[PDB]
């Protein structure tokens, strides 16, 4: 049972899913994730994903958190987000306001790769939204959509904090969506990925190696693996960041 997802293993198992990071900035991640983890005071800091841009300087997004508690019937993780365009330095990815998030969600297309660009919307009167706001809104839209862990990977201790299950025996049937849940579902609640919309998740289970791949279909580019022999899971987003809103015609 892993404590935190391992970046070498997520890039090893999800490489056949096209979720690969460059050779230089993988080594830059190996040096710079521990630095930002120590100076940010985070217990866990993993590579969340990579969002592709138009100028080729893609946003590596990382996610970290300290506490993980049961708020209002949900496993709320107090996550902080960081971005990078080289893998070596990590800037803060600031949260976006509630009214600004709708304007960010109406902005379609691939990001430009300039952290100082403003997109404009007309709703007459024009609004200027920074590209980091669009980035944070796409990131936490994907993160509230997917956030896949195996079921019963976490338990709820006496102080009502979502801690990892050290005695996690493993998913009994890794080929099923019943084995996997969202990160924000409470342990023992019985809400798995089977209680999503049917057809929004695709599981391929290599029955011999014991490696299962759960792919999102609302967000094509979210990949998750679960290795049953190693008891090792991990996930990563690689794509432009846009929701598949044509889903009824896709399936």
């Amino acid at each position: 049972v892993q404590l935190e997802p391992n970046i070498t293993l997520v890039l090893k198992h999800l490489a056949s899913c096209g979720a690969v990071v460059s050779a230089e900035q993988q080594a830059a991640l190996d040096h710079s994730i521990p630095i930002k983890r120590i100076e940010a005071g985070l217990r866990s800091l993993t590579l969340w994903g990579r969002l592709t841009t138009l100028n080729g300087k893609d946003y590596l997004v990382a996610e970290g958190y300290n506490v993980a508690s049961s708020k209002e019937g949900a496993a709320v993780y107090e996550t902080k987000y960081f971005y990078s365009q080289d893998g070596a330095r990590w800037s803060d990815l600031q949260p976006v306001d509630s009214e600004t998030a709708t304007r960010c969600a109406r902005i379609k297309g691939m990001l430009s790769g300039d952290p100082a660009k403003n997109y404009e919307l007309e709703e007459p009167l024009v609004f200027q939204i920074p590209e980091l706001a669009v980035l944070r809104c796409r990131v936490d839209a994907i993160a509230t959509a997917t956030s896949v862990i195996p079921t019963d990977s976490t338990i709820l201790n006496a102080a009502s904090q979502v801690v990892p299950n050290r005695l996690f025996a493993g998913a009994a049937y890794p080929e099923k969506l019943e084995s996997y849940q969202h990160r924000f579902s409470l342990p023992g609640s019985g809400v798995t990925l089977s209680q999503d919309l049917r057809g929004t998740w695709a599981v391929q289970y290599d029955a011999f190696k014991g490696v299962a791949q759960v792919r999102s279909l609302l967000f094509p580019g979210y990949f998750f693996y679960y290795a049953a022999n190693e008891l090792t899971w991990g996930s990563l987003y690689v794509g432009d960041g846009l929701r598949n809103n044509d889903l009824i015609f896709m399936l």
């Binding site: 900035q25 138009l54 902005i107 297309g109 430009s112 997109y119």
Partner: peptide, 23 residues
């Protein structure tokens, strides 16, 4: 052209191996 920018996105984007130009 997608919503938010009136410039049409190019059909092809660059991709780079190194962060520095001088590598």
């Amino acid at each position: 052209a997608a919503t938010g920018d009136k410039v049409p996105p190019p059909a092809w984007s660059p991709v780079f191996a190194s962060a520095s130009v001088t590598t």
